[PDB]
């Protein structure tokens, strides 16, 4: 299961339109426990590629993002990339860009802002599996540190 807040959805949505007409990629940070993931911060790394529909894994930005997570004490949950005006789900060539074992790839459909399809796809060897997104009204009690 994956859980994120309204604010995170808003953050992803903002990043999506921000990147247009290019596609919007980046990472998701927060806490992962019981294999489940809670997105407490969206990491807009911006499209390190030049493609409009295909994404990059933002190599340099990865090092920046992990460096950030080490500062606050969070972990890497997965990544997300949104298509400009095209639907969700990973395409044949799009999926080939997955040089990972079975991470979480969120693909957002910005075909319409009235109904942007947001799902989390697990790209595995055997195939792609769907993870459902649960919303949280509030953040996980701020950065939390005594």
Tokens found for residue 48 = 């390190």
Burial level of 95, CB count in 10 A (0-12/13-18/19+)? middle
d(CA 46, CA 143): 24
Task: Please tell me the experimental approach by which this structure was elucidated.
Answer: NMR
In the structure, how many helices (H) and strands (E) does the chain have? 3, 8
Q: How far is CA 44 from CA 17, 93, 111, 126, in A?
A: 12, 23, 20, 29
The CA-based angle 123-132-96, given to 5 degrees, is: 15
DSSP 53: S
Tell the residue number behind the tokens 């927060």, with chain if given: 30
3-state secondary structure of 70: helix
Domains observed in the chain: 1-146 (3.40.140.10)
Q: Name the E strands within the chain.
A: 2-5, 24-33, 36-43, 75-83, 104-109, 117-123, 128-131, 133-136
Q: Is the distance from CB of 52 to CB of 78 less than 8 angstroms?
A: no
Question: What's the CA gap between 111 and 109, in Å, rounded?
Answer: 5
Tokens 């991470």 label which residue? Answer: 103
**How far apart are the C-alpha atoms of 123 and 133, rounded to whole Å?**
16
* Nearest C-alpha neighbor of 20 from the set 45, 57, 53: 53
8, with CB counted inside 10 A (0-12, 13-18, 19+), is buried
Paired tokens of 99: 């040089």
**E strand intervals along 63-103:** 75-83
- Preceding peptide of 21 cis, ω within 30°: yes
What 3-state class would DSSP assign to 92? helix
């Amino acid at each position: 299961m994956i859980t994120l807040t309204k604010k995170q959805m808003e953050e992803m949505l903002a990043h999506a339109r921000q990147a247009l007409p290019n596609e919007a990629c980046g990472l998701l940070g927060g806490r992962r426990d019981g294999d489940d993931r809670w997105v407490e911060r969206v990491y807009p790394l911006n499209n390190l590629d030049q493609s409009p529909e295909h994404f990059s894994m933002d190599p340099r930005e990865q090092l920046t993002a992990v460096k950030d997570m080490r500062k606050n004490g969070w972990v890497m949950l997965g990544n997300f990339h949104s298509h400009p005006a095209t639907p969700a789900r990973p395409s044949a060539e799009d999926k080939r860009l997955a040089f990972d074992p079975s991470l979480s790839y969120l693909i957002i459909s910005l075909a319409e802002p009235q109904k942007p399809v947001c799902k989390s796809f697990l790209i595995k060897k055997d195939g792609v599996d769907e993870e459902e997104i649960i919303l949280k009204e509030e953040l996980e009690h701020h950065h939390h540190h005594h």
